[PDB]
Design a protein around this ligand. Structure first.
Ligand SMILES: [Zn+2]
Lengths: 351, 232, 77
């Protein structure tokens, strides 16, 4: 467990507070960018490199057949594992554009080719959703399950804007939790089903969801309706037997008061939970370890590295996981005149 | 409020009743919203200015009914977004800025194609085609490479969020031609068409004799930046 | 039209009133009551057909622009 300051050499004004790290095929890819794609990168995506503390950003390049993507803010990132047919996939859906709007489309991102000179090329295939599509929402979660043995994807949670009847120029910027119904989407074709469950009284937002062996455990769950941060941990167990996807659930006693967490995979299934926040005011500082197996998730607190006075005294803080028990975090920065690089960086490490 | 004209009862057109005598004045410019925000972050600007766009778009259809002159009466509206600068005009329309290859907001000629042919052109740009061409850029139905997807849409990258009349701004045009003639005068004092590659030293040096010449003749001290009256 | 502070105006009001008045200017609280005719949110109207996703109250004055932002810290602030 350790934290180290990193200095972003240059081009750090394009990182915004909500953004994503997709770790696939060696290098990790920054996604989500401040503003629209400057012709410095008409794509929008970056390869990130950490070297002697330096945070260096390179501009990725799409393939010819790929459709291009506008930068979602807080979408649901889903790692689709490497197998037939085209390994390996990232399911990105849905976020909010750099223009404050919600994008209810489904994008699939993969790796294509390298180098020549180490360069790595990506490609995005937009995937049609027939349905029963879920409405554009943000803060939700998407997860991949393998059930005897077909792979499917489960979509649940997240806020959205007021319905377009009550959408009011006085309630525009207000969000209300979209209703809590689980969407089962096939990777191919685009057939999306909607299920409802009784135990799910209300939808959530910002609750990290985990999936293994076609079962999903949901932590946190800041509900803005009752303003609670429920520490109950939820479980659902689904099985796809053609043609209905029968789905069941259970509530568990204990989960955790965390919203917006940074979950880094380290082992096969051992995770370190970095956490965003315990309370409205008071951010989360302790680090926890979350293993999970066929029994269930097994919880353990880890010694958090000693935070600098700066990072202990931050009003807000966010970040993400470079993966494999190492994570990257950013802090709003105050200065006069404004630096302007607003955000400071730590490299956190497990063991 | 630019003009008010009349339509009832038919056959004819709009009969103007009122046309603003001094539209360029400040005293006739009505503020609606103030923010402590920068123009740059698109995120915060659209978050705030969204409800406004929906109202404009939602007001275009209906008819107003107001007690005026003693009677309830009905109005219709035509909005003309023209008071934007080009930085924001191009920002607000998905276009790339500002030394881009596609220079013109109205026509499709590149920089090269704008030094070759100066005059023969036709107005093309508007809102809706920009929307559809953004579609062409996002869906990518023809599986084209970046530079050529760039070429099929002719500079349409980001999604327009707002409609602005495709119009030119007067005042900044005067400033641009004035900075160009100022830069040209700096070059001509010295020999630029004799020596095609000067350094910065002669540029500041040429600027110094111009400024001295401007003060002795016409009585105008230099400005860090040429405001409109100095351009007059 | 002169950037006159409320208190600057009252000093002048006392000044011109006490001396030879026959006050001419009006007090502040009648300026403050005779203005609501000039600012927005006072006259009635009706849009035919009904405006899209706009409330029907015709008396809204100055509203704050966040427009019902869901202030919770964890989201965009
Ligand atoms: Zn043109």
């Amino acid at each position: 467990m350790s934290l180290q300051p990193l200095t972003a050499v240059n081009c750090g004004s394009l990182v915004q507070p909500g953004f994503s790290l997709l770790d696939l095929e060696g290098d990790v890819y920054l996604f989500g960018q401040k503003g629209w794609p400057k012709r410095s990168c008409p794509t929008g995506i970056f390869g990130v490199r950490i070297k002697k503390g330096e945070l260096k950003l390179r501009a990725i390049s799409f393939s010819n057949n790929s459709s291009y993507l506008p930068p979602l803010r807080c979408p649901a990132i889903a790692h689709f594992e490497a197998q037939d047919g085209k390994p390996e996939c990232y399911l990105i859906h849905g976020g909010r554009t750099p223009n404050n709007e919600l994008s209810s489309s489904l994008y699939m991102l993969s790796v294509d080719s390298r180098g020549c000179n180490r360069k790595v090329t990506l490609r995005c295939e937009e995937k049609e959703l027939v349905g029963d599509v879920p409405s554009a929402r943000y803060g939700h979660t998407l997860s991949v399950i393998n059930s005897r043995g077909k792979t499917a994807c489960v979509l649940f949670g997240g806020r959205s804007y007021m319905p377009p009847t009550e959408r009011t120029t006085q309630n525009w910027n207000s969000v209300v939790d979209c209703p809590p119904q689980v969407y089962l989407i096939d990777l191919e074709f685009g057939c999306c089903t909607a299920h409802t469950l009784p135990e799910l009284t209300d939808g959530q937002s910002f609750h990290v969801a985990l999936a293994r062996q076609d079962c999903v455990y949901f932590l946190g769950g800041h509900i803005l309706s009752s303003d609670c941060r429920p520490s109950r941990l939820i479980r659902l167990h689904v099985e796809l037997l053609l043609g209905s996807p029968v789905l069941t659930c259970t509530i568990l006693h204990e989960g955790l008061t965390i919203t917006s967490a940074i979950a880094s995979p380290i082992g096969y299934h051992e995770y370190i939970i970095f956490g965003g926040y315990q309370s409205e005011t008071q951010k989360r500082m302790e680090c926890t370890y979350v293993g999970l197996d066929d029994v269930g998730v097994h919880m353990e607190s880890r010694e958090p590295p000693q935070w600098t006075s700066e990072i202990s005294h931050s009003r807000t803080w966010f970040g993400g996981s470079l993966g494999k028990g190492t994570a990257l975090v950013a802090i709003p920065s105050e200065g006069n005149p404004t630096p302007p690089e607003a955000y400071h960086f730590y490299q956190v490490s497990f063991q | 409020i630019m003009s008010i004209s009349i339509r009832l009862e038919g056959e004819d057109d709009g009969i103007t009743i009122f046309q603003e005598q001094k539209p360029n004045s400040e005293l006739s410019c009505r503020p609606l919203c103030l923010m402590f925000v920068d123009e740059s972050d698109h995120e915060t600007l659209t978050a705030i200015l969204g409800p406004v766009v929906a109202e404009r778009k939602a007001m275009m259809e209906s008819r107003l009914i107001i007690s005026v002159g003693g009677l309830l009466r009905s109005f219709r509206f035509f909005f003309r977004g023209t008071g934007y600068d080009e930085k924001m005009v191009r920002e607000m329309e998905g276009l790339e800025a500002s030394g881009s290859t596609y220079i013109c907001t109205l026509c499709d000629s590149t920089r090269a194609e704008a030094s070759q042919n100066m005059v023969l052109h036709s107005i093309t740009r508007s809102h809706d085609e920009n929307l559809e061409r953004y579609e062409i850029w996002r869906k990518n139905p023809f599986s084209e490479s970046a530079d050529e997807l760039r070429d099929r849409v002719k500079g349409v990258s980001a999604k327009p969020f707002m409609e602005t009349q495709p119009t030119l701004d007067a005042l900044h045009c005067d400033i641009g031609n004035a900075t160009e003639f100022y830069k040209i005068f700096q070059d001509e004092i010295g020999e630029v068409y004799q020596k095609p590659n000067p350094s910065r030293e002669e540029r500041r040096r040429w600027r110094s004799t111009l400024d001295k010449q401007l003060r002795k003749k016409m009585k105008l001290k230099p400005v860090m930046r040429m405001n409109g009256n100095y351009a007059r | 039209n002169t950037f006159l502070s409320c208190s600057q105006y009252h000093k002048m009001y006392r000044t011109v009133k006490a001396t030879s008045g026959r006050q001419i200017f009006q007090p502040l609280h009648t300026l403050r009551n005779a203005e609501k005719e000039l600012l927005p949110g006072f006259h009635q109207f009706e849009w035919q057909p009904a405006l899209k996703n706009v409330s029907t109250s015709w008396d809204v004055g100055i509203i704050d622009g966040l427009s019902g932002w869901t202030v919770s810290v964890d989201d965009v602030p």
